[PDB]
Design a protein around this ligand. Structure first.
Ligand code: HEM
Length: 291
């Protein structure tokens, strides 16, 4: 199936900047969530999980249809906790009922990265809601207890290469693992609601010990109180991933640029943009607007 981007009728960059801004203002206001981490990280994860169901082989799943709104997908065990991002976005959608679900979930992620001082992420509109029977089955999102070979093969289905995978994984600077959600517990670093290359620095520089958590799963833990999932740690076990980890640990701008590209790509897999579609939008942050 072909999913052609269709601009919400009559809307232009200013309309979407208003949605951006409303997301960004609520991110600022609703600051208590998750022990004052705030909603930035879970909005980034929501954008990724609503996009990461894509299968390049038949164009099923992906961000276009906004299918997370249907119970099969919002109740995927892999999506445990993302209901908090959805509830956050609900008043946004009520204020701007014209935006499609896929456009709102993906825009939430863009807005979160940027408001957390991350790179600009160009964003295109035009996702169109598709019906309940287009919701992908559970099981397309990745397991965390696996090795580098798993990770590499997993991400081929999303048409991501080694550099794109290592870049995307840098989002694990943000937020934390929650035992009751995923069976893993702990943050990956100190700056977990500011977008930086800390994930790579911690991988290389902390002294990691392989421990079992209280759900009886293995994870890597440091004396600083940080953790890494087995799939995170695989990025320094595999020599190809390791090289790229070192690159991003040593060049913040390069990480920003590569993350931006990969994240836009993730959010756009499966969508065909007509030749005369609008160019991608780059939203101003609240700070850049003086708001
Ligand atoms: C091999 C791939 C990946 C695996 C196995 C994985 C696994 C996980 C797990 C188990 C959690 C913790 C969930 C919880 O307990 O709350 C998590 C959190 C998170 N992941 Fe991933 N992840 C992967 C890739 C990504 C990518 C590609 C992104 C986005 C670019 C991403 C963004 C996040 C964020 C932002 C959080 C924190 C959420 C929060 O604090 O609520 N992850 N991930």
């Amino acid at each position: 199936l072909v999913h052609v981007a269709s601009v919400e009728k009559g809307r232009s960059y200013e309309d979407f900047q208003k949605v951006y801004n409303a997301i960004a203002l609520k991110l600022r206001e609703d600051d208590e969530y998750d022990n004052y981490i705030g909603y930035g990280p879970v909005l980034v994860r929501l954008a990724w999980h609503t996009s990461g169901t894509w299968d390049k082989h038949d164009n099923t799943g992906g961000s276009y249809g906004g299918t997370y709104r249907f119970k099969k997908e919002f109740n995927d065990p892999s999506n445990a906790g993302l209901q908090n991002g959805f509830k956050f976005l609900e008043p946004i959608h009520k204020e701007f009922p014209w935006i499609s679900s896929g456009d709102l979930f993906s825009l939430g992620g863009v807005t979160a990265v940027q408001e957390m001082q991350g790179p600009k992420i160009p964003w295109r509109c035009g996702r169109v809601d598709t019906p309940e029977d287009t919701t992908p089955d559970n099981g397309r999102l990745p397991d965390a207890d696996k090795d580098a070979d798993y990770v590499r093969t997993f991400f081929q289905r999303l048409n991501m290469n080694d550099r794109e995978v290592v870049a995307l994984m840098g989002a694990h600077a943000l937020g934390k693992t929650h035992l009751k959600r995923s069976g893993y517990e702990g943050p990956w670093g100190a700056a977990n609601n500011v977008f930086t290359n800390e994930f790579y620095l911690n991988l290389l520089n902390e002294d990691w010990k392989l421990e079992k958590n209280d759900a009886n799963n293995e994870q890597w833990d440091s004396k600083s109180g940080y953790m890494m999932l087995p799939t995170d740690y695989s990025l320094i076990q595999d020599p190809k991933y390791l090289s790229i980890v070192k690159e991003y640990a040593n060049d913040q701008d390069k990480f920003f640029k590569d993350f931006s590209k990969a994240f836009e790509k993730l959010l756009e897999n499966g969508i065909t943009f007509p030749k005369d579609a609008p160019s991608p939008f780059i939203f101003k942050t609240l700070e850049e607007q003086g708001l």
